[PDB]
Amino acid sequence: MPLDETNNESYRYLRSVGNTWKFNVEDVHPKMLERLYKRFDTFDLDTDGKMTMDEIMYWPDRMRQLVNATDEQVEKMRAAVHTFFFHKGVDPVNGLKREDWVEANRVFAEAERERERRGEPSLIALLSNAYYDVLDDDGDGTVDVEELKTMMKAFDVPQEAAYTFFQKADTDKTGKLERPELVHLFRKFWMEPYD
Ligand code: NI
């Protein structure tokens, strides 16, 4: 029933490197509780209180429909999404229960911090750089605001949210999100509190 190294990849990883981190729900702010549960319920397509990989993969598959990405780009995105949500606690067999979702998110965040400290690759960056190429339907090597709006549409976010996020991440002022700026955006969208 409770998350640990036997049923959650992020606990598995922390314990493998001696990280003693423990979850305390009192640490999670109300905004983040609100956003996490809303994300769960949006992802939980059948409203059974469980998140499964099949439900998670509906969204990148909708992204694929809205662009014309290469088969290998699409396969990189599929792989990245699978790895990301596995490390977020979505067992490919057991899924993940609503009541463990907040905790699954917070142990994943500690595991990304441990990775950072250890110079190991960020899984958020992996997810962002795989989506990058799929979003870049132009072929121009970058993501422009229309390319980001398409992502909003695939995710049932109103296409006007794109202008906000884009402005905040294009600190370059290039009119494009280069790969570090989409990382920045994905770190917020998929983990960190909004500033
Ligand atoms: Ni940044």
JSON list of C-alpha atoms and ligand atoms in Angstrom, two decimals:
[
{"chain": "A", "resi": 1, "resn": "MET", "atom": "CA", "xyz": [0.00, 0.00, 0.00]},
{"chain": "A", "resi": 2, "resn": "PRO", "atom": "CA", "xyz": [2.63, 2.63, 0.96]},
{"chain": "A", "resi": 3, "resn": "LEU", "atom": "CA", "xyz": [5.21, 3.90, -1.51]},
{"chain": "A", "resi": 4, "resn": "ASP", "atom": "CA", "xyz": [8.74, 2.62, -1.05]},
{"chain": "A", "resi": 5, "resn": "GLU", "atom": "CA", "xyz": [11.60, 1.19, -3.05]},
{"chain": "A", "resi": 6, "resn": "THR", "atom": "CA", "xyz": [9.57, -1.93, -3.91]},
{"chain": "A", "resi": 7, "resn": "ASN", "atom": "CA", "xyz": [6.82, -0.13, -5.81]},
{"chain": "A", "resi": 8, "resn": "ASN", "atom": "CA", "xyz": [8.13, 3.37, -6.72]},
{"chain": "A", "resi": 9, "resn": "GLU", "atom": "CA", "xyz": [11.14, 4.12, -8.91]},
{"chain": "A", "resi": 10, "resn": "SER", "atom": "CA", "xyz": [11.97, 7.40, -7.21]},
{"chain": "A", "resi": 11, "resn": "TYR", "atom": "CA", "xyz": [12.13, 5.79, -3.74]},
{"chain": "A", "resi": 12, "resn": "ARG", "atom": "CA", "xyz": [14.11, 2.95, -5.32]},
{"chain": "A", "resi": 13, "resn": "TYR", "atom": "CA", "xyz": [16.60, 5.46, -6.68]},
{"chain": "A", "resi": 14, "resn": "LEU", "atom": "CA", "xyz": [17.00, 7.54, -3.53]},
{"chain": "A", "resi": 15, "resn": "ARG", "atom": "CA", "xyz": [17.58, 4.47, -1.36]},
{"chain": "A", "resi": 16, "resn": "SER", "atom": "CA", "xyz": [20.09, 3.14, -3.91]},
{"chain": "A", "resi": 17, "resn": "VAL", "atom": "CA", "xyz": [22.29, 6.23, -3.28]},
{"chain": "A", "resi": 18, "resn": "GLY", "atom": "CA", "xyz": [21.66, 6.44, 0.47]},
{"chain": "A", "resi": 19, "resn": "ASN", "atom": "CA", "xyz": [19.28, 9.40, 0.34]},
{"chain": "A", "resi": 20, "resn": "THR", "atom": "CA", "xyz": [17.17, 9.32, 3.53]},
{"chain": "A", "resi": 21, "resn": "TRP", "atom": "CA", "xyz": [14.43, 11.70, 2.37]},
{"chain": "A", "resi": 22, "resn": "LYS", "atom": "CA", "xyz": [11.00, 11.30, 3.97]},
{"chain": "A", "resi": 23, "resn": "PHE", "atom": "CA", "xyz": [7.70, 12.68, 2.78]},
{"chain": "A", "resi": 24, "resn": "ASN", "atom": "CA", "xyz": [5.81, 15.18, 4.95]},
{"chain": "A", "resi": 25, "resn": "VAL", "atom": "CA", "xyz": [2.44, 16.27, 3.54]},
{"chain": "A", "resi": 26, "resn": "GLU", "atom": "CA", "xyz": [2.50, 19.38, 5.77]},
{"chain": "A", "resi": 27, "resn": "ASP", "atom": "CA", "xyz": [5.22, 20.74, 3.49]},
{"chain": "A", "resi": 28, "resn": "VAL", "atom": "CA", "xyz": [2.96, 20.93, 0.42]},
{"chain": "A", "resi": 29, "resn": "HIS", "atom": "CA", "xyz": [1.29, 24.32, -0.11]},
{"chain": "A", "resi": 30, "resn": "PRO", "atom": "CA", "xyz": [-2.42, 24.56, -0.94]},
{"chain": "A", "resi": 31, "resn": "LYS", "atom": "CA", "xyz": [-1.83, 25.85, -4.45]},
{"chain": "A", "resi": 32, "resn": "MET", "atom": "CA", "xyz": [0.28, 22.77, -5.18]},
{"chain": "A", "resi": 33, "resn": "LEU", "atom": "CA", "xyz": [-2.25, 20.39, -3.65]},
{"chain": "A", "resi": 34, "resn": "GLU", "atom": "CA", "xyz": [-4.91, 22.03, -5.80]},
{"chain": "A", "resi": 35, "resn": "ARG", "atom": "CA", "xyz": [-2.86, 21.81, -9.00]},
{"chain": "A", "resi": 36, "resn": "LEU", "atom": "CA", "xyz": [-1.66, 18.26, -8.39]},
{"chain": "A", "resi": 37, "resn": "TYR", "atom": "CA", "xyz": [-5.12, 16.83, -7.75]},
{"chain": "A", "resi": 38, "resn": "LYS", "atom": "CA", "xyz": [-6.51, 18.70, -10.76]},
{"chain": "A", "resi": 39, "resn": "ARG", "atom": "CA", "xyz": [-3.77, 17.18, -12.91]},
{"chain": "A", "resi": 40, "resn": "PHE", "atom": "CA", "xyz": [-4.54, 13.73, -11.55]},
{"chain": "A", "resi": 41, "resn": "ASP", "atom": "CA", "xyz": [-8.23, 14.04, -12.24]},
{"chain": "A", "resi": 42, "resn": "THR", "atom": "CA", "xyz": [-7.64, 15.40, -15.72]},
{"chain": "A", "resi": 43, "resn": "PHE", "atom": "CA", "xyz": [-5.30, 12.47, -16.47]},
{"chain": "A", "resi": 44, "resn": "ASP", "atom": "CA", "xyz": [-7.60, 9.87, -14.85]},
{"chain": "A", "resi": 45, "resn": "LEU", "atom": "CA", "xyz": [-9.69, 9.56, -17.98]},
{"chain": "A", "resi": 46, "resn": "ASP", "atom": "CA", "xyz": [-12.17, 7.02, -16.59]},
{"chain": "A", "resi": 47, "resn": "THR", "atom": "CA", "xyz": [-12.42, 8.64, -13.11]},
{"chain": "A", "resi": 48, "resn": "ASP", "atom": "CA", "xyz": [-11.64, 5.43, -11.21]},
{"chain": "A", "resi": 49, "resn": "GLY", "atom": "CA", "xyz": [-9.11, 6.99, -8.81]},
{"chain": "A", "resi": 50, "resn": "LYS", "atom": "CA", "xyz": [-6.16, 5.37, -10.59]},
{"chain": "A", "resi": 51, "resn": "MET", "atom": "CA", "xyz": [-3.71, 6.77, -13.11]},
{"chain": "A", "resi": 52, "resn": "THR", "atom": "CA", "xyz": [-2.45, 4.27, -15.72]},
{"chain": "A", "resi": 53, "resn": "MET", "atom": "CA", "xyz": [0.16, 4.54, -18.46]},
{"chain": "A", "resi": 54, "resn": "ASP", "atom": "CA", "xyz": [-2.56, 4.06, -21.05]},
{"chain": "A", "resi": 55, "resn": "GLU", "atom": "CA", "xyz": [-4.29, 7.15, -19.77]},
{"chain": "A", "resi": 56, "resn": "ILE", "atom": "CA", "xyz": [-1.03, 9.14, -19.57]},
{"chain": "A", "resi": 57, "resn": "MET", "atom": "CA", "xyz": [-0.11, 8.28, -23.18]},
{"chain": "A", "resi": 58, "resn": "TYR", "atom": "CA", "xyz": [-3.35, 9.73, -24.58]},
{"chain": "A", "resi": 59, "resn": "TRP", "atom": "CA", "xyz": [-1.81, 13.18, -24.38]},
{"chain": "A", "resi": 60, "resn": "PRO", "atom": "CA", "xyz": [1.46, 12.75, -26.32]},
{"chain": "A", "resi": 61, "resn": "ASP", "atom": "CA", "xyz": [-0.50, 10.72, -28.81]},
{"chain": "A", "resi": 62, "resn": "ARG", "atom": "CA", "xyz": [-2.80, 13.74, -29.29]},
{"chain": "A", "resi": 63, "resn": "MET", "atom": "CA", "xyz": [0.31, 15.90, -29.69]},
{"chain": "A", "resi": 64, "resn": "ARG", "atom": "CA", "xyz": [1.44, 13.52, -32.46]},
{"chain": "A", "resi": 65, "resn": "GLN", "atom": "CA", "xyz": [-1.88, 13.93, -34.26]},
{"chain": "A", "resi": 66, "resn": "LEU", "atom": "CA", "xyz": [-1.58, 17.73, -34.43]},
{"chain": "A", "resi": 67, "resn": "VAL", "atom": "CA", "xyz": [1.88, 17.87, -36.02]},
{"chain": "A", "resi": 68, "resn": "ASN", "atom": "CA", "xyz": [3.82, 15.88, -38.62]},
{"chain": "A", "resi": 69, "resn": "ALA", "atom": "CA", "xyz": [6.80, 14.68, -36.63]},
{"chain": "A", "resi": 70, "resn": "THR", "atom": "CA", "xyz": [9.17, 12.01, -37.71]},
{"chain": "A", "resi": 71, "resn": "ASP", "atom": "CA", "xyz": [8.58, 8.46, -36.56]},
{"chain": "A", "resi": 72, "resn": "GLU", "atom": "CA", "xyz": [11.80, 8.55, -34.54]},
{"chain": "A", "resi": 73, "resn": "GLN", "atom": "CA", "xyz": [10.92, 11.87, -32.97]},
{"chain": "A", "resi": 74, "resn": "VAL", "atom": "CA", "xyz": [7.59, 10.37, -31.94]},
{"chain": "A", "resi": 75, "resn": "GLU", "atom": "CA", "xyz": [9.28, 7.29, -30.52]},
{"chain": "A", "resi": 76, "resn": "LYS", "atom": "CA", "xyz": [11.69, 9.46, -28.50]},
{"chain": "A", "resi": 77, "resn": "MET", "atom": "CA", "xyz": [8.70, 11.36, -27.08]},
{"chain": "A", "resi": 78, "resn": "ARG", "atom": "CA", "xyz": [6.86, 8.11, -26.27]},
{"chain": "A", "resi": 79, "resn": "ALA", "atom": "CA", "xyz": [9.98, 6.77, -24.51]},
{"chain": "A", "resi": 80, "resn": "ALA", "atom": "CA", "xyz": [10.52, 9.99, -22.58]},
{"chain": "A", "resi": 81, "resn": "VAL", "atom": "CA", "xyz": [6.91, 10.16, -21.43]},
{"chain": "A", "resi": 82, "resn": "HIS", "atom": "CA", "xyz": [7.05, 6.55, -20.30]},
{"chain": "A", "resi": 83, "resn": "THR", "atom": "CA", "xyz": [10.24, 7.10, -18.34]},
{"chain": "A", "resi": 84, "resn": "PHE", "atom": "CA", "xyz": [8.99, 10.34, -16.83]},
{"chain": "A", "resi": 85, "resn": "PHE", "atom": "CA", "xyz": [5.72, 8.93, -15.57]},
{"chain": "A", "resi": 86, "resn": "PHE", "atom": "CA", "xyz": [7.29, 5.68, -14.38]},
{"chain": "A", "resi": 87, "resn": "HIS", "atom": "CA", "xyz": [9.57, 7.79, -12.23]},
{"chain": "A", "resi": 88, "resn": "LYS", "atom": "CA", "xyz": [6.49, 9.80, -11.15]},
{"chain": "A", "resi": 89, "resn": "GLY", "atom": "CA", "xyz": [5.13, 6.52, -9.74]},
{"chain": "A", "resi": 90, "resn": "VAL", "atom": "CA", "xyz": [2.91, 5.27, -12.57]},
{"chain": "A", "resi": 91, "resn": "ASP", "atom": "CA", "xyz": [3.69, 1.58, -12.51]},
{"chain": "A", "resi": 92, "resn": "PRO", "atom": "CA", "xyz": [3.05, 0.17, -16.02]},
{"chain": "A", "resi": 93, "resn": "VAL", "atom": "CA", "xyz": [1.14, -2.72, -14.42]},
{"chain": "A", "resi": 94, "resn": "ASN", "atom": "CA", "xyz": [-0.40, -1.27, -11.24]},
{"chain": "A", "resi": 95, "resn": "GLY", "atom": "CA", "xyz": [-0.87, 2.35, -12.23]},
{"chain": "A", "resi": 96, "resn": "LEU", "atom": "CA", "xyz": [-0.95, 4.81, -9.35]},
{"chain": "A", "resi": 97, "resn": "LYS", "atom": "CA", "xyz": [-3.73, 5.66, -6.87]},
{"chain": "A", "resi": 98, "resn": "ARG", "atom": "CA", "xyz": [-5.00, 9.19, -6.30]},
{"chain": "A", "resi": 99, "resn": "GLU", "atom": "CA", "xyz": [-4.10, 9.00, -2.60]},
{"chain": "A", "resi": 100, "resn": "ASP", "atom": "CA", "xyz": [-0.42, 8.44, -3.46]},
{"chain": "A", "resi": 101, "resn": "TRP", "atom": "CA", "xyz": [-0.20, 11.08, -6.19]},
{"chain": "A", "resi": 102, "resn": "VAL", "atom": "CA", "xyz": [1.01, 14.05, -4.12]},
{"chain": "A", "resi": 103, "resn": "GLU", "atom": "CA", "xyz": [3.62, 11.90, -2.44]},
{"chain": "A", "resi": 104, "resn": "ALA", "atom": "CA", "xyz": [4.73, 10.38, -5.76]},
{"chain": "A", "resi": 105, "resn": "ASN", "atom": "CA", "xyz": [5.28, 13.92, -7.07]},
{"chain": "A", "resi": 106, "resn": "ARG", "atom": "CA", "xyz": [7.29, 15.04, -4.08]},
{"chain": "A", "resi": 107, "resn": "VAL", "atom": "CA", "xyz": [9.62, 12.04, -4.00]},
{"chain": "A", "resi": 108, "resn": "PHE", "atom": "CA", "xyz": [10.22, 12.51, -7.72]},
{"chain": "A", "resi": 109, "resn": "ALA", "atom": "CA", "xyz": [11.26, 16.12, -7.02]},
{"chain": "A", "resi": 110, "resn": "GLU", "atom": "CA", "xyz": [13.82, 14.99, -4.43]},
{"chain": "A", "resi": 111, "resn": "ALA", "atom": "CA", "xyz": [15.14, 12.40, -6.90]},
{"chain": "A", "resi": 112, "resn": "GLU", "atom": "CA", "xyz": [15.65, 15.12, -9.52]},
{"chain": "A", "resi": 113, "resn": "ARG", "atom": "CA", "xyz": [17.53, 17.18, -6.92]},
{"chain": "A", "resi": 114, "resn": "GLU", "atom": "CA", "xyz": [19.73, 14.13, -6.12]},
{"chain": "A", "resi": 115, "resn": "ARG", "atom": "CA", "xyz": [20.40, 13.65, -9.78]},
{"chain": "A", "resi": 116, "resn": "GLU", "atom": "CA", "xyz": [21.35, 17.27, -10.14]},
{"chain": "A", "resi": 117, "resn": "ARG", "atom": "CA", "xyz": [23.75, 17.12, -7.31]},
{"chain": "A", "resi": 118, "resn": "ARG", "atom": "CA", "xyz": [25.26, 14.02, -8.82]},
{"chain": "A", "resi": 119, "resn": "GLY", "atom": "CA", "xyz": [25.58, 15.34, -12.33]},
{"chain": "A", "resi": 120, "resn": "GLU", "atom": "CA", "xyz": [23.18, 12.73, -13.63]},
{"chain": "A", "resi": 121, "resn": "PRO", "atom": "CA", "xyz": [20.68, 13.63, -16.39]},
{"chain": "A", "resi": 122, "resn": "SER", "atom": "CA", "xyz": [17.42, 15.35, -15.42]},
{"chain": "A", "resi": 123, "resn": "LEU", "atom": "CA", "xyz": [14.34, 13.44, -16.43]},
{"chain": "A", "resi": 124, "resn": "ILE", "atom": "CA", "xyz": [12.44, 16.69, -16.85]},
{"chain": "A", "resi": 125, "resn": "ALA", "atom": "CA", "xyz": [15.05, 17.78, -19.39]},
{"chain": "A", "resi": 126, "resn": "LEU", "atom": "CA", "xyz": [14.73, 14.44, -21.15]},
{"chain": "A", "resi": 127, "resn": "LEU", "atom": "CA", "xyz": [10.95, 14.97, -21.44]},
{"chain": "A", "resi": 128, "resn": "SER", "atom": "CA", "xyz": [11.36, 18.56, -22.63]},
{"chain": "A", "resi": 129, "resn": "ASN", "atom": "CA", "xyz": [13.99, 17.79, -25.28]},
{"chain": "A", "resi": 130, "resn": "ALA", "atom": "CA", "xyz": [11.92, 14.93, -26.70]},
{"chain": "A", "resi": 131, "resn": "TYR", "atom": "CA", "xyz": [8.82, 17.05, -26.95]},
{"chain": "A", "resi": 132, "resn": "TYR", "atom": "CA", "xyz": [10.90, 19.88, -28.40]},
{"chain": "A", "resi": 133, "resn": "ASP", "atom": "CA", "xyz": [11.46, 18.15, -31.69]},
{"chain": "A", "resi": 134, "resn": "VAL", "atom": "CA", "xyz": [7.86, 17.05, -31.92]},
{"chain": "A", "resi": 135, "resn": "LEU", "atom": "CA", "xyz": [6.61, 20.59, -31.24]},
{"chain": "A", "resi": 136, "resn": "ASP", "atom": "CA", "xyz": [8.98, 22.02, -33.80]},
{"chain": "A", "resi": 137, "resn": "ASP", "atom": "CA", "xyz": [6.71, 21.24, -36.75]},
{"chain": "A", "resi": 138, "resn": "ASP", "atom": "CA", "xyz": [8.51, 24.05, -38.70]},
{"chain": "A", "resi": 139, "resn": "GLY", "atom": "CA", "xyz": [11.74, 22.19, -38.90]},
{"chain": "A", "resi": 140, "resn": "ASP", "atom": "CA", "xyz": [13.52, 25.38, -37.87]},
{"chain": "A", "resi": 141, "resn": "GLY", "atom": "CA", "xyz": [15.23, 23.92, -34.85]},
{"chain": "A", "resi": 142, "resn": "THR", "atom": "CA", "xyz": [13.18, 26.00, -32.38]},
{"chain": "A", "resi": 143, "resn": "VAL", "atom": "CA", "xyz": [9.73, 26.27, -30.86]},
{"chain": "A", "resi": 144, "resn": "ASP", "atom": "CA", "xyz": [7.67, 29.35, -31.76]},
{"chain": "A", "resi": 145, "resn": "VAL", "atom": "CA", "xyz": [4.45, 30.50, -30.10]},
{"chain": "A", "resi": 146, "resn": "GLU", "atom": "CA", "xyz": [2.14, 28.72, -32.56]},
{"chain": "A", "resi": 147, "resn": "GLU", "atom": "CA", "xyz": [4.12, 25.53, -32.01]},
{"chain": "A", "resi": 148, "resn": "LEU", "atom": "CA", "xyz": [3.55, 25.97, -28.26]},
{"chain": "A", "resi": 149, "resn": "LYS", "atom": "CA", "xyz": [-0.17, 26.69, -28.72]},
{"chain": "A", "resi": 150, "resn": "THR", "atom": "CA", "xyz": [-0.49, 23.37, -30.51]},
{"chain": "A", "resi": 151, "resn": "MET", "atom": "CA", "xyz": [0.86, 21.76, -27.36]},
{"chain": "A", "resi": 152, "resn": "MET", "atom": "CA", "xyz": [-1.74, 23.61, -25.31]},
{"chain": "A", "resi": 153, "resn": "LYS", "atom": "CA", "xyz": [-4.50, 22.36, -27.60]},
{"chain": "A", "resi": 154, "resn": "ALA", "atom": "CA", "xyz": [-3.29, 18.76, -27.32]},
{"chain": "A", "resi": 155, "resn": "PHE", "atom": "CA", "xyz": [-3.37, 19.14, -23.54]},
{"chain": "A", "resi": 156, "resn": "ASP", "atom": "CA", "xyz": [-6.80, 20.83, -23.27]},
{"chain": "A", "resi": 157, "resn": "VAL", "atom": "CA", "xyz": [-5.14, 24.01, -22.02]},
{"chain": "A", "resi": 158, "resn": "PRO", "atom": "CA", "xyz": [-6.65, 27.18, -23.55]},
{"chain": "A", "resi": 159, "resn": "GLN", "atom": "CA", "xyz": [-4.40, 28.32, -26.38]},
{"chain": "A", "resi": 160, "resn": "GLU", "atom": "CA", "xyz": [-4.06, 31.75, -24.72]},
{"chain": "A", "resi": 161, "resn": "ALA", "atom": "CA", "xyz": [-2.08, 30.24, -21.84]},
{"chain": "A", "resi": 162, "resn": "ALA", "atom": "CA", "xyz": [0.70, 29.80, -24.42]},
{"chain": "A", "resi": 163, "resn": "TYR", "atom": "CA", "xyz": [1.35, 33.54, -24.82]},
{"chain": "A", "resi": 164, "resn": "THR", "atom": "CA", "xyz": [1.88, 33.87, -21.06]},
{"chain": "A", "resi": 165, "resn": "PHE", "atom": "CA", "xyz": [4.28, 30.94, -20.66]},
{"chain": "A", "resi": 166, "resn": "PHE", "atom": "CA", "xyz": [6.16, 31.86, -23.81]},
{"chain": "A", "resi": 167, "resn": "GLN", "atom": "CA", "xyz": [6.75, 35.46, -22.74]},
{"chain": "A", "resi": 168, "resn": "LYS", "atom": "CA", "xyz": [8.02, 34.20, -19.42]},
{"chain": "A", "resi": 169, "resn": "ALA", "atom": "CA", "xyz": [10.41, 31.61, -20.82]},
{"chain": "A", "resi": 170, "resn": "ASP", "atom": "CA", "xyz": [11.74, 33.50, -23.89]},
{"chain": "A", "resi": 171, "resn": "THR", "atom": "CA", "xyz": [14.08, 35.64, -21.82]},
{"chain": "A", "resi": 172, "resn": "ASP", "atom": "CA", "xyz": [16.35, 35.59, -24.91]},
{"chain": "A", "resi": 173, "resn": "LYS", "atom": "CA", "xyz": [13.80, 37.79, -26.63]},
{"chain": "A", "resi": 174, "resn": "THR", "atom": "CA", "xyz": [14.28, 35.68, -29.78]},
{"chain": "A", "resi": 175, "resn": "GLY", "atom": "CA", "xyz": [10.56, 35.08, -30.38]},
{"chain": "A", "resi": 176, "resn": "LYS", "atom": "CA", "xyz": [11.45, 31.35, -30.07]},
{"chain": "A", "resi": 177, "resn": "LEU", "atom": "CA", "xyz": [11.90, 28.92, -27.18]},
{"chain": "A", "resi": 178, "resn": "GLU", "atom": "CA", "xyz": [15.36, 27.42, -27.54]},
{"chain": "A", "resi": 179, "resn": "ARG", "atom": "CA", "xyz": [15.95, 24.09, -25.79]},
{"chain": "A", "resi": 180, "resn": "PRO", "atom": "CA", "xyz": [16.93, 25.53, -22.34]},
{"chain": "A", "resi": 181, "resn": "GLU", "atom": "CA", "xyz": [13.91, 27.74, -22.32]},
{"chain": "A", "resi": 182, "resn": "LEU", "atom": "CA", "xyz": [11.52, 24.89, -22.97]},
{"chain": "A", "resi": 183, "resn": "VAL", "atom": "CA", "xyz": [13.26, 23.04, -20.14]},
{"chain": "A", "resi": 184, "resn": "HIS", "atom": "CA", "xyz": [12.57, 26.03, -17.93]},
{"chain": "A", "resi": 185, "resn": "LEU", "atom": "CA", "xyz": [8.92, 25.93, -19.03]},
{"chain": "A", "resi": 186, "resn": "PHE", "atom": "CA", "xyz": [8.59, 22.17, -18.50]},
{"chain": "A", "resi": 187, "resn": "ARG", "atom": "CA", "xyz": [10.11, 22.39, -15.07]},
{"chain": "A", "resi": 188, "resn": "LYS", "atom": "CA", "xyz": [7.28, 24.71, -14.10]},
{"chain": "A", "resi": 189, "resn": "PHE", "atom": "CA", "xyz": [4.54, 22.91, -16.04]},
{"chain": "A", "resi": 190, "resn": "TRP", "atom": "CA", "xyz": [5.46, 19.49, -14.70]},
{"chain": "A", "resi": 191, "resn": "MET", "atom": "CA", "xyz": [6.98, 20.05, -11.23]},
{"chain": "A", "resi": 192, "resn": "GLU", "atom": "CA", "xyz": [7.76, 23.37, -9.69]},
{"chain": "A", "resi": 193, "resn": "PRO", "atom": "CA", "xyz": [5.49, 25.99, -8.29]},
{"chain": "A", "resi": 194, "resn": "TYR", "atom": "CA", "xyz": [4.47, 28.76, -10.61]},
{"chain": "A", "resi": 195, "resn": "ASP", "atom": "CA", "xyz": [6.25, 31.96, -9.81]},
{"chain": "B", "resi": 1, "resn": "NI", "atom": "NI", "xyz": [15.02, 29.28, -15.80]}
]
